[PDB]
Amino acid sequence: KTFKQRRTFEQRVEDVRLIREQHPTKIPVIIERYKGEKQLPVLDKTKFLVPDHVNMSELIKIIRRRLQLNANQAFFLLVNGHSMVSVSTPISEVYESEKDEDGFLYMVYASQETF
Numbered sequence: 001k002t003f004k005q006r007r008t009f010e011q012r013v014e015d016v017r018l019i020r021e022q023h024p025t026k027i028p029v030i031i032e033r034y035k036g037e038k039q040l041p042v043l044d045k046t047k048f049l050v051p052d053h054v055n056m057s058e059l060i061k062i063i064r065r066r067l068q069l070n071a072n073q074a075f076f077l078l079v080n081g082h083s084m085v086s087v088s089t090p091i092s093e094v095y096e097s098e099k100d101e102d103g104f105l106y107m108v109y110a111s112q113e114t115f
C-alpha cells in the first residue's frame, strides 16, 4: 500500500539517482496521507519534485492547494516521522538533515496534530 512497500530499497535508490541526473535542482519528496486519516482526501500522486529554494511554509501552502483545502480545514505535516521544528527552513537544508537512507524526503499529513 505505502511507497516503501511498493518499491524495493534498490528501486527507490535508483529513482533518486535519476532525479539527481534529470532534475538536479529538485528535492525528491514522498507525500502520503496518515493511514488513520478520516477528514482530508488522498493526493493524486505520491512522488513530488520540489524546487530546492522553497521553505517548509510554502511547501505546506503548495500541498493545501493540491488538496484544494479551504481556509479553516486543519493540516499537519510530519517530516521523517516527526513535527517540523521550523517552517522557515529552506527545503535544501531540511533535505540534508531529514532525508531517508534511500535518498527520498518522507512526509505524512493529517487533520489531527495527534497522528
Ligand SMILES: COc1ccccc1-c1nnc(N)o1
Pocket: 016, 017, 018, 020, 021
Ligand atoms: C552516491 O551516488 C552514486 C553512487 C554510485 C553510483 C552512482 C551514484 C549516483 N548518484 N546520482 C547518480 N545519478 O548516480
Ligand SMILES: [Cl-]
Pocket: 022, 023, 024, 025, 026
Ligand atoms: Cl532541475
